[PDB]
Scaffold this active site. Sequence first.
Site, PDB file in Angstrom:
ATOM      1  N   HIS A  43       0.229  20.525 -12.091  1.00  0.00           N
ATOM      2  CA  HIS A  43       1.108  21.422 -12.867  1.00  0.00           C
ATOM      3  C   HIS A  43       1.156  20.929 -14.507  1.00  0.00           C
ATOM      4  CE1 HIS A  43       4.808  18.352 -13.611  1.00  0.00           C
ATOM      5  NE2 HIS A  43       3.885  17.770 -13.244  1.00  0.00           N
ATOM      6  N   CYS A  97       4.337  15.384 -18.389  1.00  0.00           N
ATOM      7  CA  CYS A  97       4.346  14.455 -17.158  1.00  0.00           C
ATOM      8  C   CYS A  97       3.117  13.500 -17.241  1.00  0.00           C
ATOM      9  CB  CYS A  97       4.014  15.445 -15.945  1.00  0.00           C
ATOM     10  SG  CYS A  97       4.201  14.493 -14.271  1.00  0.00           S
ATOM     11  N   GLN A 115      11.322  18.404  -6.468  1.00  0.00           N
ATOM     12  CA  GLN A 115      12.571  19.163  -6.804  1.00  0.00           C
ATOM     13  C   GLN A 115      12.461  20.671  -6.017  1.00  0.00           C
ATOM     14  OE1 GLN A 115      13.106  17.418 -11.083  1.00  0.00           O
ATOM     15  NE2 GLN A 115      14.462  18.851 -10.527  1.00  0.00           N
ATOM     16  N   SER A 138      13.596  18.451 -14.388  1.00  0.00           N
ATOM     17  CA  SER A 138      12.742  17.994 -15.426  1.00  0.00           C
ATOM     18  C   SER A 138      12.081  18.701 -16.718  1.00  0.00           C
ATOM     19  CB  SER A 138      11.517  17.433 -14.651  1.00  0.00           C
ATOM     20  OG  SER A 138      11.523  16.820 -13.514  1.00  0.00           O
ATOM     21  N   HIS A 141       7.686  24.062 -15.595  1.00  0.00           N
ATOM     22  CA  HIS A 141       6.648  23.732 -15.154  1.00  0.00           C
ATOM     23  C   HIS A 141       5.583  25.144 -15.118  1.00  0.00           C
ATOM     24  CE1 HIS A 141       8.340  20.111 -13.414  1.00  0.00           C
ATOM     25  NE2 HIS A 141       9.309  21.065 -13.112  1.00  0.00           N
TER      26      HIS A 141
END
Length: 147
Positions: A43, A97, A115, A138, A141
């Site tokens: 991702h 990330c 998630q 977060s 993505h």
Amino acid sequence: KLPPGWEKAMSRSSGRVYYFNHITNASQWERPSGEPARVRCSHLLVKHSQSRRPSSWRQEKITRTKEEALELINGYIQKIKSGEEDFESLASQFSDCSSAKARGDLGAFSRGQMQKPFEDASFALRTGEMSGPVFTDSGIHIILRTE
Ligand SMILES: OCc1ccc2nc[nH]c2c1
Ligand SMILES: [Cl-]
């Protein structure tokens, strides 16, 4: 009719049908082709000011808005889809990330680990398919299913 999550829509600018997936936020002109215990995904995350942790290896304090993050995500998808740029080139350079150092690879995972919006998109992708923008706590993505 169509694989999980897929629906027909009409292009506002062209008037041709296209296909949209409301779990992965993928969209494409062509009719989608044709569940495993585990999938493997990479991702690219773009964080924003409402991200659960507004920090990343790229930026100590991430201040961009959700809308600015979405525009960054959208531009990355455009460059991936056009072939100007590869998914892992962009992930390595721009994902918020730590998996950027692994070209965005997160390894294999089962349901009930990630998630929920991420998990559902990941398991609705076919091997080799890429999501549209996927929203979690977060950030936003782009998800590529590799296995
Ligand atoms: O579970 C979704 C998810 C997956 C990977 C992540 N890296 C940073 N934040 C993340 C959130
Ligand atoms: Cl996080």
